[PDB]
């Protein structure tokens with residue numbers, strides 16, 4: 164997929180559709196097996212097509228902004244606990260265009276408290292999309308286990324939608340997790 | 343992995359450890375996009391190692407039966423809603439031994455009502471293992487989308503622990519889903 168500057172994406176003609184997705188994350192002081200730092204809780208979802216992706220969806224003709232569309236979709240996807248926050252332009256990270264349909268994909272990362280993130284997980288089964296478009300939420304393991312394979316490297320071998328794997332890796336880099 | 347009859351597995355010496363996992367499923371009359379029959383809700387979990395597997399765990403020295411160990415582990419894994427049912431010997435399907443450590447893996451499939459299954463999903467964030475060994479629950483997409491790839495075939499391209507992919511496929515066959 165080609166990366167576009169936000170200005171260029173916003174200048175695309177009306178035939179282009181805009182989709183927005185968000186990486187929700189929270190600092191986590193927890194330790195797996197009492198010794199492996201978790202560092203952050205970072206959410207993805209298993210999608211209806213058997214691929215991992217981020218929560219979000221299409222901006223429609225009555226969204227006044229990309230961010231209004233994103234928050235509307237997040238709340239459909241994830242349920243009422245997503246109404247505890249708004250993802251904003253300050254959280255914007257990137258825009259990409261893939262091959263095929265006229266779709267531009269905008270990506271955001273939003274910091275939550277761990278309590279807010281847990282609340283999103285705890286309420287997700289009541290979301291409109293649960294058991295339809297969204298098959299379940301999962302956290303991303305950020306550590307690599309002693310065999311050098313288990314954890315993040317194996318997680319990254321799963322199937323991902325569109326540019327989601329690249330969006331994840333860019334965000335993990337920006338968080339200082341790939342040093 | 344080699345398949346063993348239950349009698350043979352139960353005759354293994356004390357140095358062998360026994361692990362038990364369960365496929366929990368419920369009939370689901372729902373339709374994706376109003377046209378694709380879901381057929382069943384079937385649960386798996388994203389594990390700490392980045393692989394998909396089934397809920398369960400090790401039988402210990404104070405479990406009086408394989409099934410007591412299974413139910414104890416399920417309830418640690420999944421939380422209080424798993425106490426609404428017991429997986430029993432009538433639900434037993436298979437035993438396998440892989441290479442390496444002395445572990446025999448017993449597999450079960452347990453029918454729930456859709457309300458019971460939803461309750462398991464709805465309560466899983468309060469489980470002891472949530473955000474540690476268990477990164478999230480996911481449903482298995484049983485359909486194949488119009489491109490011939492999306493849905494089950496793509497789901498099966500994800501990373502799976504041990505014999506979990508084979509256990510899934512055997513269960514799906516037994517349910518008549520691979521006709």
Ligand SMILES: O=c1[nH]cnc2c1ncn2[C@@H]1O[C@H](COP(=O)(O)O)[C@@H](O)[C@H]1O
Nearest residue numbers: 182184216217218266268324325326327
């Ligand atoms: O998490 C994601 N990151 C980036 N693009 C995505 C993600 N999820 C869906 N898409 C894209 O969003 C559009 C709609 O996909 P859908 O979710 O299958 O309806 C397609 O162009 C997908 O590639």
Ligand SMILES: O=c1[nH]cnc2c1ncn2[C@@H]1O[C@H](COP(=O)(O)O)[C@@H](O)[C@H]1O
Nearest residue numbers: 361363395396397445447503504505506
């Ligand atoms: O869902 C599963 N199906 C079959 N074996 C499993 C499953 N999950 C874990 N195991 C096995 O259970 C044992 C313990 O694995 P652990 O969950 O990583 O502690 C190993 O022998 C794994 O291969």
Ligand SMILES: [Cl-]
Nearest residue numbers: 307308309310
């Ligand atoms: Cl380890």
Ligand SMILES: [Cl-]
Nearest residue numbers: 486487488489
């Ligand atoms: Cl389709």
Ligand SMILES: [Mg+2]
Nearest residue numbers: 218219220240
């Ligand atoms: Mg969505």
Ligand SMILES: [Mg+2]
Nearest residue numbers: 219220221236
């Ligand atoms: Mg949507």
Ligand SMILES: [Mg+2]
Nearest residue numbers: 397398399419
């Ligand atoms: Mg377990």
Ligand SMILES: [Mg+2]
Nearest residue numbers: 398399400415
């Ligand atoms: Mg356990």
